[PDB]
Design a protein around this ligand. Structure first.
Ligand SMILES: CCCCCCCCCCCCCCCCCC(=O)OC[C@H](CO[C@@H]1O[C@H](CO[C@H]2O[C@H](CO)[C@H](O)[C@H](O)[C@H]2O)[C@H](O)[C@H](O)[C@H]1O)OC(=O)CCCCCCCCCCCCCCCCC
Ligand code: CLA
Ligand code: CLA
Ligand code: CLA
Ligand SMILES: C=Cc1c(C)c2cc3nc(c4c5[nH]c(cc6nc(cc1[nH]2)C(C)=C6CC)c(C)c5C(=O)[C@@H]4C(=O)OC)[C@@H](CCC(=O)OC/C=C(\C)CCC[C@H](C)CCC[C@H](C)CCCC(C)C)[C@@H]3C
Ligand SMILES: CC(C)=CCC/C(C)=C/CC/C(C)=C/CC/C(C)=C/CC/C(C)=C\CC/C(C)=C/CC/C(C)=C/CC/C(C)=C/CC/C(C)=C/CC1=CC(=O)C(C)=C(C)C1=O
Ligand SMILES: CCCCCCCCCCCCCCCCCC(=O)OC[C@H](CO[C@@H]1O[C@H](CO)[C@H](O)[C@H](O)[C@H]1O)OC(=O)CCCCCCCCCCCCCCCCC
Ligand SMILES: CCCCCCCCCCCCCCCC(=O)OC[C@H](CO[C@@H]1O[C@H](CS(=O)(=O)O)[C@@H](O)[C@H](O)[C@H]1O)OC(=O)CCCCCCCCCCCCCCC
Ligand SMILES: CCCCCCCCCCCCCCCC(=O)OC[C@H](COP(=O)(O)OC[C@@H](O)CO)OC(=O)CCCCCCCCCCCCCCC
Ligand SMILES: CC1=C(/C=C/C(C)=C/C=C/C(C)=C/C=C/C=C(C)/C=C/C=C(C)/C=C/C2=C(C)CCCC2(C)C)C(C)(C)CCC1
Ligand SMILES: CCCCCCCCCCCCCCCCCC(=O)O
Ligand SMILES: CCCCCCCCCCCCCCCCCC(=O)O
Ligand code: OEX
Ligand SMILES: [Cl-]
Ligand SMILES: [Cl-]
Ligand SMILES: [Fe+2]
Lengths: 36, 34, 37, 341, 65, 36, 30, 33, 82, 38, 334, 28, 32, 36, 30
């Protein structure tokens, strides 16, 4: 069960970091009109 | 000029006249005690 | 005697196919419990 | 010009409230149905038919007033004012439940009048009659619930009474006695109503968020012109959005708006059919396989069996007061009850 | 079109498509009969409903003797 | 023809509804229907 | 047998979703 | 569970017969071009 | 845009309108008031007064139980309160 | 053998005829005075 | 050319058949987990002790349910609001008995649906659209939070959240009415007005546009072929629609501005469903529907029943029977 | 009985009042 | 007679599925 | 990206008749054994 | 059910005979 707990913690951390860093990667600029 | 009495005039008063009457009757009811 | 002039081709487009299959499958999903009872 | 044609002319004049030939049926019947409800909910009791107060005069509020059904003892009497029950006495007619049949029957003919008006105006203006067709759904619901349903039962007593709480009681009656939530025809009605509200919301939002910039204002309502030929929003962008969000999207505006007619109208028609069945107590009450298992296996329990216990509670606890003509006397010891409650 | 012996005999019964009487014709007489039939159906309904009660008309199974 | 400003018509009518409705809520707590 | 039937119909619906999304008739402009 | 054994064939034909109808019509639509 | 009747906003801001309706509206209100305060509403519609639902030592509902004698039953019940 | 309820039936029948006849009498009158000009 | 920026460009690409996006990075795994667990539990989960009284309720197909009766059963009342992931059970057998899957499914689902809403914002921005479709979806989303999360929080137990099943739903509705008189609560009445009105206006709008389609086809073809995707001209005559609807009622009760019309279509059901979601969310804290029980009494003090007292009799029958083995004390305070 | 005129008097008087105030324009 | 209850569905499907296959092929042959 | 190996398929009316007869007669033959 | 099934199949065959004879594809010389 502890192996399972660790795996999920790692998987969740990974996706959440993708989310946080993705939106920090200049998201306002990713539109089709004004990019600033 | 504008006419006074119309089908519209009738439809309006067909509803407005009894509405006010009922409203007065329902007002009086708030003071009924048992 | 001339062939019948009132004949018309019939059509069912792909979207109508998908809509009709969904309807039938969902209807079956709904009524089957009642048929087995 | 013949007299009939001159009356036609007058009936069909463009005025603030169009009249039409349909108006002769619609306007008296609608106003009488509406006036009967206001009259009865303001002044008339249900003491002699139901053992209930039901008017503002008696102390009820907007939620609990009703025009209640006639007593079960009236059967399906038309309860005409001049009929054999009231014998022309207006007061007794009120006390016997005559306003119920008065409202229901005038209401029915008013509904006919309204659908005829939809036909009449559509013919005069030159449009297709689909709004009339759509209105068949409200008609089917009205006749099936207010007329067919009580006609299969013992009397008008068991029809819905015209009131907010009285309808709430009707809902609960249908749960406890008919297990109406389990009925696939009600379920199809639920899907068409909830599906209609979804379509309404999602279509309006889509249009409002795919608008073309047709003016400089921050209030986008001003940049529409009822005679412009151009579409005011982008079907193309709407379609792309929904295709990428949901997988599928509308591409055909005609199909889209027909579908919007179709979904709620069909759903209402389906629920009406189920109510016609309940007129005869032809319920979807049980699943036989479940009952056979549960009778034999006291450890077998499902949400289906749990809900029948609730129905059983509803019936025993509401019947004596809800059906006073039956003179049900249930001593405390026979009431179904769980532990403690 | 194909002629047949039976068709030739029935022919006149399908020969007046579109022929009308002028104006209103018998419309007033039709209206009379419609009104009579309405009253007659009203009566029948109200007998069944026991809103119209007539001597010697027992609206019950017990009218089978 | 246009003598009385409509904003005044609307305020007075508006207040008149607040009054009747208020009376009806008052009557929920007094007399018939009050539970007392 | 009833379980098989319910799950079969459900599975057909999921398969239909696949075709309806990925093998739709493509919307084409004007 | 003691279900109605005819529920199976009822369900099978309820699915099959309308579905086949639509497939027939769709495929002959495609082959028109 | 218009069918020739007089605009509502023109009517309800007019002096004459309010000359008439400052009478007719309160008059109708007072009529409906009196319909109740006099007790007439009770008698017209047959609605029990707070003292007239039950007889003094009575917790039985006066429920109509016959179709063709219903009129007389109600009358019988009312006389049980005189 | 003309029972109370048959009498009531006739009362209802005349009442209705009066209502519809009065209504149509009035609509005919109004339509004849206030014609459309063509 | 940098790996992270190419990944970023694929995540936010408008060229993917289904848009992914940053909200999608969370939505996809959480919806797949909820969906896969749901399907498996619905088919094969063993019976669950929903009310914590060692009285397990069978919810799955293989344990004697059909589609109508089957459910994923809420987690045990013994757990209450405690977090019950798999790794907290001594075994999967234990986790299944106590209703673990319910928790996994609803938490993954609520997270995924939340991200679904954000995803709707996100693609609208990538496409240069206006942003508020996601605001329309907040009405159904709020309603799911109400029955899966807020109501359990207020009552203290996920065992009183809505079951994931057709008959389970009805059970939840009936119990709710007995304990909260939801029918007599104005926010639910507004929900009905939102949903009945939404269905009404759906049909109205569909029938008025359908009534005024411009003739573009013959009697032998579907009228839908009179519209071609992306054509610039409107496909119906809104002035004719208005000319009909304004006469059906009167002129000023009919829209001639299509923008106001479609805004109204959006706003009526959204706002009604917001209220009904708030109804469930505030009855979660036991601020219940109006109680007019015995509100009418006579000159002597006899109770004069109204239709509200009849409702009450029905509510009592629901109250005294629900969870018939679970109460030892006389008030069902949660 | 008497209560019926008590009720009907404000109606008739209101009707009379409007009759007086409008008769000139109704004529036109 | 105590026959096999699955016999009915086996026979019905035995007829229906192959027959439908042929009908589908024939109809789309005719419409080109 | 259209695939060139695609071919239309045909079943003429006579083949429908022969095929339908085969299936029906096969069903008439095997059904007794299916019911057993 | 089994009697109905046998007669049904036999009746379909008789129907097939009718169509096979009277609605055959006519043989044409060419
Ligand atoms: C859609 C478009 C909508 C347009 C509709 C517009 C509105 C039209 C308004 C129509 C008004 C309907 C009148 C209904 C009255 C009715 O029925 O009243 C019922 C009466 C019969 O009376 C009932 O009869 C019952 C059976 O009695 C009989 O049986 C007993 C045996 O115990 C005794 O022997 C008794 O003497 C004997 O008469 C009980 O006595 C009931 O108390 C008594 O009410 O029928 C009769 O009037 C007539 C019955 C035959 C006529 C058929 C009526 C058709 C309508 C019904 C169709 C729905 C069917 C429902 C089934 C589900
Ligand atoms: C569109 C108009 C309309 C319609 C359709 C109805 C319909 C109805 N009304 Mg309502 N009603 C209306 C207008 C209308 N009403 C108006 C304007 C009023 C206010 C006065 C009322 C007041 C009213 C009351 C108070 C009651 C009804 C009732 C009824 C029902 C029974 C009617 C009946 O039996 O008729 C019977 C009559 C006819 C069908 C008329 C037919 C005409 C005949 C054929 C011609 C007669 C020929 C003549 C007599 C011969 C002349 C010879 C001479 C020399 C003597 C029915 C639902 C009853 C009800 O609701 O029951 C619960 C009831 O009690 N109505
Ligand atoms: C998700 C919850 C849900 C949903 C969406 C529905 C949806 C529905 N229910 Mg179900 N219901 C539910 C839960 C739900 N139900 C539950 C839990 C129960 C307990 C078992 C029930 C019990 C129940 C009953 C008992 C009935 C329904 C019915 C219906 C249908 C109503 C159709 C309609 O609009 O009637 C509204 C009425 C009309 C459309 C009639 C015509 C109305 C005219 C046009 C009115 C005109 C008014 C006038 C102009 C203005 C008046 C002014 C005045 C108000 C001031 C619809 C399919 C009804 C049904 O199936 O009918 C066939 C029905 O009888 N439901
Ligand atoms: C005619 C009678 C009637 C009517 C019309 C209604 C109508 C309604 N009731 Mg009421 N109810 C009734 C009678 C009625 N009720 C009775 C008799 C009772 C007592 C027995 C109740 C008790 C009751 C309760 C206890 C509750 C309601 C609720 C509701 C609402 C249900 C719709 C909803 O929540 O949408 C909102 C939208 C949703 C719930 C959908 C969420 C969608 C999510 C976000 C996404 C789903 C994705 C999905 C899983 C996958 C799709 C896959 C794709 C491939 C298709 C609605 C306002 C509910 C409510 O207000 O909820 C807030 C509620 O909890 N009612
Ligand atoms: C409770 C729900 C509900 C109500 C209140 C309602 C109301 C209405 N729908 C109408 C239309 C429609 N409804 C439609 C679809 C739908 N309608 C639905 C549900 C409803 N529709 C649903 C769910 C749909 C989707 C299919 C369409 C397609 C239309 C229209 O075209 C039409 C319209 O113009 O809408 C804008 C209007 C018809 C006006 C009329 O007949 O005047 C004449 C008045 C008459 C004849 C009086 C009727 C008297 C009734 C039948 C009995 C008495 C009622 C009492 C007075 C009040 C009782 C109140 C208590 C019960 C609480 C009216 C506003
Ligand atoms: C015995 C004795 C002597 C007594 C005698 C008594 C006596 C006098 C009796 C006789 C009485 C007599 C004289 C009778 C006549 C009186 C009379 C005229 C009575 C009045 C009638 C009345 C009671 C009934 C009418 C009430 C009624 C039905 C009102 C309903 C109004 C209503 C709810 C309106 C909704 C409007 C609304 C804005 C809906 C929007 C819907 C929607 C978004 C549509 C979509 C849409 C809209 C568009 O707009 C266009 C463009 C398009 C594209 C589109 O999608
Ligand atoms: C030109 C225009 C002409 C006018 C056209 C008029 C058409 C009439 C429309 C009728 C609407 C029916 C509302 C009646 C309310 C009333 O009188 O209550 C009258 C009651 C009177 O209050 C009761 O009085 C009793 C007297 O013994 C006791 O004191 C009770 O306790 C007390 O509750 O008031 C209420 O119940 C409280 C206010 C409720 C608020 C009104 C409800 C409507 C608002 C909710 C909207 C629901 C949708 C309604 C449909 C729209
Ligand atoms: C027991 C109950 C029996 C029930 C019997 C009840 C019968 C009900 C029928 C009532 C019909 C009401 C019509 C009155 C119309 C009116 O005022 O016009 C008549 C005059 C003024 O009309 C005018 O109005 C006209 C426009 S319009 O017709 O009003 O739209 C305008 O053209 C004209 O110049 C102007 O002078
Ligand atoms: C207590 C209830 C509070 C609810 C207030 C919110 C109601 C509106 C929300 C609808 C969501 C629908 C999905 C979006 C659909 C959509 O895209 O809408 C778009 C639509 C028009 O957009 P525009 O960009 O033209 O204008 C909005 C801003 O940009 C300001 O110019 O927005 C509105 O018209 C806003 C109206 C607010 C008006 C004042 C507040 C609301 C008053 C009406 C409610 C009255 C009480 C009920
Ligand atoms: C039945 C009958 C009859 C008839 C009658 C009539 C026709 C009546 C009518 C009546 C009417 C016609 C009434 C009215 C009433 C009204 C009312 C009572 C109203 C109220 C309202 C209110 C209360 C409202 C409020 C509000 C709100 C809440 C919110 C918004 C605002 C307002 C203000 C709107 C006759 C005689 C034939 C005989 C037989 C019987
Ligand atoms: C179709 C239009 C119908 C119009 C109906 C209007 C009805 C008005 C009738 C009111 C008269 C009631 C008189 C009661 C006398 C009864 C005497 C008796 O029952 O023997
Ligand atoms: C709305 C105006 C306030 C309504 C009255 C609230 C009544 C509570 C106090 C009382 O009536 O005794
Ligand atoms: O769990 Mn489900 O349900 Ca809400 O209250 Mn208490 O808890 Mn149970 O009882 Mn009533
Ligand atoms: Cl329970
Ligand atoms: Cl306890
Ligand atoms: Fe639209």
């Amino acid at each position: 069960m502890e192996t399972l707990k660790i795996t999920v913690y790692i998987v969740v951390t990974f996706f959440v970091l993708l989310f946080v860093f993705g939106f920090l990667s200049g998201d306002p600029a990713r539109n089709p009109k004004r990019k600033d | 000029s504008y006419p006074i009495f119309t089908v519209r005039w009738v439809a309006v008063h067909t509803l407005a006249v009894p509405t006010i009457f009922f409203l007065g009757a329902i007002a009086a009811m708030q003071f009924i005690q048992r | 005697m001339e062939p019948n002039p009132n004949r018309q081709p019939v059509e069912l487009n792909r979207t109508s196919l998908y809509l009709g299959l969904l309807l039938i499958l969902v209807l079956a999903l709904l009524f089957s419990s009642y048929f087995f009872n | 010009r013949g007299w009939f044609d001159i009356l036609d002319d007058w009936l069909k004049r463009d005025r603030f409230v169009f009249v039409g030939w349909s108006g002769i049926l619609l306007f008296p019947c609608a106003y009488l149905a509406l006036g009967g409800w206001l009259t009865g909910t303001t002044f008339v009791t249900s003491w002699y038919t139901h053992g209930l107060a039901s008017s503002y005069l008696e102390g009820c509020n907007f939620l609990t007033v009703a025009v209640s059904t006639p007593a079960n003892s009236m059967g399906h009497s038309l309860l005409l004012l001049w009929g054999p029950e009231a014998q022309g006495d207006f007061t007794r007619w009120c006390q016997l439940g005559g306003l119920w049949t008065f409202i229901a029957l005038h209401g029915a003919f008013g509904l006919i009048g309204f659908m005829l008006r939809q036909f009449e105006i559509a013919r005069l203006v030159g449009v297709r009659p689909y709004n009339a067709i759509a209105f068949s759904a409200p008609i089917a619901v009205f006749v099936s619930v207010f007329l067919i349903y009580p006609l299969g039962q013992s009397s008008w007593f068991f029809a819905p009474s015209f009131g907010v709480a009285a309808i709430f009681r009707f809902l609960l009656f249908f749960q406890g006695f008919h297990n109406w939530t389990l009925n696939p025809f009600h379920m199809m009605g639920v899907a068409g109503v909830l599906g209609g509200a979804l379509l309404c919301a999602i279509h309006g939002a889509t249009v409002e968020n795919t608008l073309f910039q047709d003016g400089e204002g921050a209030s986008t309502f001003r940049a529409f012109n009822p005679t412009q030929a151009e579409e005011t929003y982008s079907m193309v962008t709407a379609n792309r959005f929904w295709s990428q969000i949901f997988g599928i999207a509308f591409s055909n505006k005609r199909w889209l708006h027909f579908f919007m007619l179709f979904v709620p109208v069909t759903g209402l028609w389906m629920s009406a059919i189920g109510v016609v069945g309940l007129a005869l107590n032809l319920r979807s009450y049980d699943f036989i396989s479940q009952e056979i298992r549960a009778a034999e296996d006291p450890e077998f329990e499902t949400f289906y069996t749990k809900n029948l216990l609730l129905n059983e509670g509803i019936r025993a606890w509401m019947a004596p007061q809800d059906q006073p003509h039956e003179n049900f006397v249930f001593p405390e010891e026979v009431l179904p009850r769980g532990n403690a409650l | 079109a194909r002629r047949t012996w039976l068709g030739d005999i029935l022919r006149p019964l399908n020969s007046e498509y579109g022929k009308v009487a002028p104006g209103w014709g018998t419309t007033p007489l039709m209206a009379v009969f419609m009104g009579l039939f309405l009253v007659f159906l009203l009566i029948i309904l109200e007998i069944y409903n026991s809103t119209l009660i007539l001597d010697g008309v027992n609206v019950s199974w017990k009218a089978l003797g | 023809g246009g003598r009385i400003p409509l904003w005044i018509v609307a305020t007075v009518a508006g207040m008149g509804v607040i009054v009747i409705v208020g009376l009806f809520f008052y009557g929920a707590y007094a007399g018939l229907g009050s539970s007392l | 047998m009833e379980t098989i039937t319910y799950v079969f119909i459900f599975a057909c619906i999921i398969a239909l979703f696949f075709f309806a999304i990925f093998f739709r008739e493509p919307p084409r402009i004007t | 569970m003691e279900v109605n054994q005819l529920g199976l064939i009822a369900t099978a034909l309820f699915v099959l017969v309308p579905s086949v109808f639509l497939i027939i019509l769709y495929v002959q639509t495609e082959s028109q071009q | 845009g218009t069918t020739g009747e007089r605009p509502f906003s023109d009517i309800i801001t007019s002096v004459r309108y309010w000359v008439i309706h400052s009478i007719t509206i309160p008059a109708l209100f007072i009529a409906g008031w009196l319909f109740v305060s006099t007790g007439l509403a009770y008698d017209v519609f047959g609605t029990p007064r707070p003292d007239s639902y039950y007889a003094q030592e009575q917790r039985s509902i006066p429920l109509v139980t016959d179709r063709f004698e219903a009129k007389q039953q109600v009358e019988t019940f009312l006389e049980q309160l005189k | 053998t003309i029972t109370p309820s048959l009498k009531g039936f006739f009362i209802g029948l005349l009442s209705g005829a009066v209502v519809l006849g009065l209504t149509f009498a009035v609509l005919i009158a109004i339509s004849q005075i206030d014609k459309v000009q063509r | 050319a940098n790996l992270w920026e190419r990944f970023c460009n694929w995540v936010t690409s408008t060229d993917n058949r289904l848009y992914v996006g940053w909200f999608g990075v969370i939505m996809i795994p959480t919806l797949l987990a909820a969906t896969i667990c749901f399907v498996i539990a619905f088919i094969a989960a063993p019976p669950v002790d929903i009310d914590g009284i060692r009285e397990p309720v069978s919810g799955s197909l293989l344990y004697g349910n059909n589609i109508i009766t089957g459910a994923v059963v809420p987690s045990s009342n013994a757990i209450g609001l405690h977090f019950y992931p798999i790794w907290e059970a001594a075994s999967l057998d234990e986790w299944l008995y106590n209703g673990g899957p319910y928790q996994l499914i609803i938490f993954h689902f609520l997270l995924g649906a939340s991200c679904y809403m954000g995803r709707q914002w996100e693609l609208s921005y990538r496409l240069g659209m206006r942003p508020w479709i996601c605001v329309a979806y907040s009405a159904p989303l709020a309603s799911a939070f109400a029955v899966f999360l807020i109501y359990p929080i207020g009552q203290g137990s996920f065992s009183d959240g809505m079951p994931l099943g057709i008959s389970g739903t009805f059970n939840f509705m009936i119990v709710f009415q007995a304990e909260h008189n939801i029918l007599m609560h104005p926010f639910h009445q507004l929900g009905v007005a939102g949903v009945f009105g939404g269905a009404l206006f759906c049909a109205m709008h569909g029938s008025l546009v359908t009534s005024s389609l411009i003739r573009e086809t013959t009697e032998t073809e579907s009228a839908n072929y009179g519209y071609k995707f992306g054509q610039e001209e409107e496909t119906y005559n809104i002035v004719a629609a208005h000319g009909y609807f304004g006469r059906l009622i009167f002129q000023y009760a009919s829209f001639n501005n299509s923008r106001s019309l479609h805004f109204f279509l959006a706003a009526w059901p959204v706002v009604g469903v917001w209220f009904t979601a708030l109804g469930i969310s505030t009855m979660a804290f036991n601020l219940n529907g109006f109680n007019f029980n015995h509100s009418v009494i006579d000159a002597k003090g006899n109770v004069i029943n109204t239709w509200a007292d009849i409702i009450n009799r029905a509510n009592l029958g629901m109250e005294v029977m629900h969870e018939r083995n679970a109460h030892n004390f006389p008030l069902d305070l949660a | 009985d008497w209560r019926v005129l008590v009720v009907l008097l404000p109606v008739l008087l209101a009707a009379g009042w409007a009759v007086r105030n409008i008769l000139p324009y109704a004529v036109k």
